[PDB]
């Protein structure tokens, strides 16, 4: 097998971990298990402390010009490792030796996943969102020499069995009837979304435009603020339905990050340092942070002045469970 390793700036402290992504099912989150190595005894009595932290960070342009930023620490755990073992920990200890000491953390359920909001050109500092960290420091204050920081990411993956077909309809009297459906409720990243629309128009006035859009809603729970709405991808069609006539069509629309780079505040999957990451995956409600959800809106601009008839369909957008760990880089 292959494990990840990091060393202290002074070099006397080393940390070993087995993974970088920790799946969160309805059951317990995958436990964090690792090893700490103090090769020399420069630590006369000062011991090595291991902390697992979760951080929520938010800031918006208006709040920036006023000067208001929101920072919070949801989860903090500390362990005195230096003072049951899984197979990986025992193999690591056997390979390393006497200095190796194991540490373990258990992430409780109902905690936010790693999410980052797309920074603009002006900000060149830490990104906003929810992130996790594992910090090991030689303290019996935290010194940059002794301490080491490793960024981990709690993630979720698409459920094995999909749900019912998302379908919705409306009627409006002045009547006119609209209905629409989606092929499935779970869509993978980069896969086109196919929507079926059907309209019955019997009023004298006709319809002139049909707009289909994919909207992302990021609910920032803590430090109450309005949610983030964004038209990730839009398709506008010039179609007319005569009175006493019906009209049925199938449209295909695909979200991606190439055209949405200029948008600020767009929710994205957790980044380790700076790597390109796709659009964020819908959170399974089954918390205390950015909750990402996706919907598709179909709108008919009826008549002249005039109004529109709209239908919203919710669908889940995630990744299938992978056999191998994500590289968390650019593969080529």
């Amino acid at each position, epitope marked *: 097998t292959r494990v990840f390793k990091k060393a202290s700036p002074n070099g006397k402290l080393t940390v070993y971990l087995g993974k970088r992504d920790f799946v969160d099912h309805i059951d317990l989150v995958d436990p964090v298990d690792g090893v700490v190595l103090v090769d020399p005894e420069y630590l006369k009595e000062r011991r090595v402390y291991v902390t697992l932290t979760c951080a929520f960070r938010y800031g918006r342009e208006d709040l920036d010009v006023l000067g208001l930023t929101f920072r919070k620490d949801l989860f903090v755990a500390n362990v005195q490792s230096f003072p049951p073992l899984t197979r990986l920990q025992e193999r690591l200890i056997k390979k390393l030796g006497e200095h190796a000491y194991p540490f373990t953390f258990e992430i409780p359920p109902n905690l936010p996943c790693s999410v980052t909001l797309q920074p603009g050109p002006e900000d060149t500092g830490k990104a906003c969102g929810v992130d996790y960290e594992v910090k090991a420091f030689c303290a019996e204050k935290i010194h940059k020499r002794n301490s080491v920081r490793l960024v981990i990411e709690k993630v979720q993956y698409a459920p094995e069995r999909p749900g019912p077909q998302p379908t919705a309809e409306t009627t409006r009297q002045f009547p006119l009837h609209l209905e629409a459906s989606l092929d499935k409720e779970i869509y993978y990243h980069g*896969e086109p979304i196919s929507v079926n629309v059907h309209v019955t128009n019997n009023t004298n006035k006709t319809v002139k435009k049909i707009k289909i859009s994919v909207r992302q809603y990021a609910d920032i729970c803590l430090f109450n603020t309005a949610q983030y709405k964004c038209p990730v991808a839009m398709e506008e069609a010039d179609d007319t339905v005569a009175p006493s006539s019906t009209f049925c069509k199938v449209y295909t629309l695909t979200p991606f990050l190439a055209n949405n780079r200029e948008k600020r505040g767009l929710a994205l999957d957790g980044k380790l340092k700076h790597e*390109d990451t796709n659009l964020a995956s819908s959170t399974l409600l089954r918390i205390l942070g950015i909750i990402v959800s996706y919907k598709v809106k179909v709108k008919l601009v009826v008549s002249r002045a005039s109004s529109d008839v709209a239908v919203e369909l919710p669908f889940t957008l995630m990744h299938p469970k992978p*056999k191998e760990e*994500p590289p968390h880089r650019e593969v*080529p």
Partner: single-chain antibody, 216 residues
Framework: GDIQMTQSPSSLSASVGDRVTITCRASQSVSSAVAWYQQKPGKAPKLLIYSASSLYSGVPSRFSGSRSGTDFTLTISSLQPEDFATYYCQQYKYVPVTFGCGTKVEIVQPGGSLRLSCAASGFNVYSSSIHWVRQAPGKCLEWVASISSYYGYTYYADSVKGRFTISADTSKNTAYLQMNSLRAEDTAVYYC?????????????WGQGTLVTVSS
């Protein structure tokens, strides 16, 4: 620069029923991002092993891969007459894929311009990356260009800069190479390939290469 992926055995006697080993050496550390390919004579390469240990689906459970340092090993425990082809070594950690020299297991003026088209079915340009490679007579595989539309980035090799521009029609699900200036080294067979997005497990699917005879 281009990590030189040297394949030591040029040819092997490889009597049937025997255990055969092929080794690959990299100039720098490419981690475990190494893939193995098999090419029958006059056909497209076929992926065998990715990540240097994982067997691709549909591969008989005889090929094995291993990595100690920068040395990568492909071992076939049982050889059969069906298994007689050329074996290539690739790394996919950096921008140039830098294929390796083959190991054989045996018992139009420059102003001229031409374009090639890829007929891809059941694929999406946003969930896949499209690659263009070429093979000259008696030479290892050469990488020409790559495109990824989800992030919207294209790469070209040093020699094909300015004279090569690849594109993709998303509606027709088609890829184009669009040669403009044809220099001396453009006489080859051109292969069109597809790779996964957000994850690289080798050039899984290959297209029927086209034979081009240009440059006088």
């Amino acid at each position: 620069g281009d990590i030189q992926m040297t394949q030591s055995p040029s040819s092997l006697s490889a009597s049937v029923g025997d255990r055969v080993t092929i080794t690959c050496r990299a100039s720098q550390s490419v981690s475990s991002a190494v893939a193995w390919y098999q090419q029958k004579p006059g056909k497209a390469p076929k992926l065998l092993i990715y990540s240097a240990s994982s067997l691709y689906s549909g591969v008989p459970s005889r090929f094995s891969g291993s990595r100690s340092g920068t040395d990568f090993t492909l071992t076939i425990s049982s050889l059969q007459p069906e298994d007689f082809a050329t074996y290539y070594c690739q790394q996919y950690k950096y921008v140039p894929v830098t294929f390796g020299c083959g190991t054989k297991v045996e018992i139009v003026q420059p102003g001229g311009s031409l374009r090639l088209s890829c007929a891809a079915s059941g694929f999406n340009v946003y969930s896949s990356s499209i690659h263009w490679v070429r093979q000259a007579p008696g030479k290892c595989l050469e990488w020409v260009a790559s495109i990824s539309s989800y992030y919207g980035y294209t790469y070209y090799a040093d020699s094909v800069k300015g004279r090569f521009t690849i594109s993709a029609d998303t509606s027709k699900n088609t890829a184009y190479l669009q040669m403009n200036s044809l220099r001396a080294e453009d006489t080859a067979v051109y292969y069109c390939a597809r790779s996964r997005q957000f994850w690289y497990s080798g050039l899984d699917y290959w297209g029927q290469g086209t034979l081009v005879t240009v440059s006088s």
